[PDB]
Every structure is written in structure tokens, then in C-alpha cells.
């Protein structure tokens, strides 16, 4: 019942998922402990410093950028779930209603930029240039822009819900962890939603020396088990999508 495993997480759904599985981990001889973080920097700082043994908040493209930028010696212990990202607006209820020259507000996190670009492409409002590296797409890669949309990417991910609430810009990209915590339902409230979120699975990350840690593996397996995945699916009504790999 008792090897300690300290995991840092976003409040919702991550920390709520972790709390939910504590009794299951206790049966596997692990005492799961959760530290909640409101941003996307401190959970990685905390993992490097040892304040936590693992984190659960980021997807692989974000992880790779963070590793490159900060020389973090971390590893990906496994994907757990997807959060199809939405564009939100109180004023405009469809992308097609957005006036020409409107500004779309997205966070400063460059690894989420391709996601707003794929949403606008799926909607038929933009195309990306021929021979663009789609893996690292930025606003400079836009070719067709039917509504001549402008993009503001200055704000932190944690303040995107504020921009939405204050009605800044025609629409706002909000990561689902933040949107759900503020009472938004991505599958009902978003004016446009990301369709293929597979590359943006949220992972368990650990320091490289703990790559083979058995307790981390127990956690990953419990988090992917059928009974936990069903609970996740029921709790947030499909906005949080469990993955098996």
C-alpha cells in the first residue's frame, strides 16, 4: 500500500484523474500524491528540481520544445489522453460569421499554433504554403486567408479564458484543461473544435534516471485501464479522450 509517487498536474482533468485512481494505486502498493500547478512552466521546473517525481500536464510537441529550450533531461513515460482544442467566442457563434480582418487570439505556446491553423484549414478559411513543414507550422506558413484573419499570440495559456470572458478578439483558442475548469464544454461551447488530436496526447513525464521506474509504469497502466478510461469518458462527456498508447 505504501511506495510514495508525487505527481504534478493541471487542476482539471489531470489532478482530478489522479485523485480518482489513488485507491487503485494503493492496491498496487503505491501512495499517489498530487501537487496542482496553474501554468505550463512550473511543473517542468518542479520535475527537474525534484519537488515532484513525475508530471501530468503536457503533450509531446510541448514536451520536446521545453526539453530543447531548457536542457531538461526528461523522458516520456506514456500518453494518457487527448484534449481536442477549441476556439471560443461570446460574440460570433460560427467561424463563417467572423468579419474580415478579425483577430484570432491564441496563446504564446508555439507548439499549439498548428492546432488553430488545422481548425481554420478544416473550416476552409486558410491554406498553408506548398512545402510547409506542417509539424512546426506557424502563422508565416499561411497561404490562402479568405477572411484576412489576424493573429495575436502574445498571451500566456493561463489567461486565455480571461481574454474570452472580456470578449477580446473575434475568437480565442483555449486549451481544454483551462476551458473545462472554467465551466466550458468543448464539445458544445466551442465554435470550432480540433478534429484529429492524436499528436497532442497528454503524457506522464519523468526524469531520465526514472525511465524504468516500476511505480511510474503501474500508474500509467492504471490510468489506461478500461474502468478508468470509461470513468474519464463519462465524467467530461467526451471532451477528454483516453488513449491506449
Distance CA 82, CA 240 (A): 6
In the shown chain, the binding pattern of residues 76 to 105 toward ligand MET, with x for contact by CB under 6 A and - for none, equals -------x-x--------------------
57 binds ligand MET (CB under 6 A): yes
Distance between CA atoms of 50 and 8, rounded to whole angstroms?
Answer: 11
State which of residues 16, 52, 58, 220 lies at the interface with ligand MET (CB under 6 A).
58
Binding mask 162-201 for ligand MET (x = CB under 6 A): -------------xxx----------------------x-
Q: What is the rounded distance in angstroms from the CA atom of residue 161 to the CA atom of residue 10?
A: 15
Total residues at interface with ligand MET (CB under 6 A): 13
User: What is the x/- site pattern for ligand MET, positions 125-164, by CB under 6 A?
Assistant: ----------------------------------------
Task: With CA atoms as reference, report the closest residue to 80 among 237, 213, 240.
Answer: 240
As measured in angstroms, the least distance from the Cβ of 104 to ligand MET is 17
Q: Quick one: which H or E segment has residue 231?
A: helix 226-235
Closest CA to 151 of 194, 99, 106: 106
Amino acid at each position: 500500500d505504501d511506495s510514495v509517487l508525487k505527481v504534478g498536474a493541471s487542476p482539471v482533468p489531470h489532478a482530478e484523474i489522479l485523485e480518482h485512481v489513488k485507491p487503485l494505486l494503493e492496491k498496487e502498493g503505491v501512495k499517489l500524491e498530487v501537487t496542482t500547478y496553474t501554468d505550463y512552466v512550473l511543473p517542468n521546473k518542479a520535475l527537474e528540481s525534484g519537488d515532484i517525481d513525475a508530471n501530468y500536464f503536457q503533450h509531446v510537441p510541448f514536451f520536446n520544445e521545453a526539453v530543447k529550450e531548457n536542457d531538461y533531461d526528461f523522458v516520456n513515460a506514456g500518453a494518457i489522453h487527448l484534449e481536442p482544442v477549441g476556439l471560443y467566442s461570446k460574440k460570433y457563434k460560427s467561424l463563417q460569421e467572423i468579419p474580415d480582418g478579425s483577430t484570432i487570439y491564441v496563446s504564446s505556446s508555439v507548439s499549439d499554433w498548428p492546432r488553430v491553423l488545422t481548425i481554420l484549414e478544416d473550416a476552409g478559411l486558410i491554406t498553408l504554403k506548398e512545402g510547409v513543414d506542417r509539424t512546426t507550422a506557424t502563422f508565416d506558413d499561411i497561404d490562402k486567408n479568405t477572411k484576412k484573419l489576424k493573429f495575436n499570440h502574445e498571451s500566456d495559456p493561463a489567461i486565455m479564458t480571461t481574454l474570452y470572458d472580456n470578449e477580446e478578439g473575434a475568437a480565442v483558442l483555449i486549451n481544454s484543461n483551462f476551458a473545462v475548469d472554467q465551466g466550458l464544454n468543448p464539445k458544445k461551447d466551442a465554435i470550432a473544435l480540433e478534429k484529429e488530436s492524436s499528436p497532442y496526447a497528454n503524457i506522464i513525464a519523468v526524469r531520465k534516471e526514472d525511465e524504468n521506474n516500476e511505480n511510474v509504469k503501474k500508474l500509467v497502466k492504471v490510468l489506461r485501464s478500461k474502468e478508468v478510461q470509461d470513468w474519464i469518458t463519462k465524467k467530461w462527456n467526451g471532451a477528454i479522450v483516453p488513449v491506449n498508447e
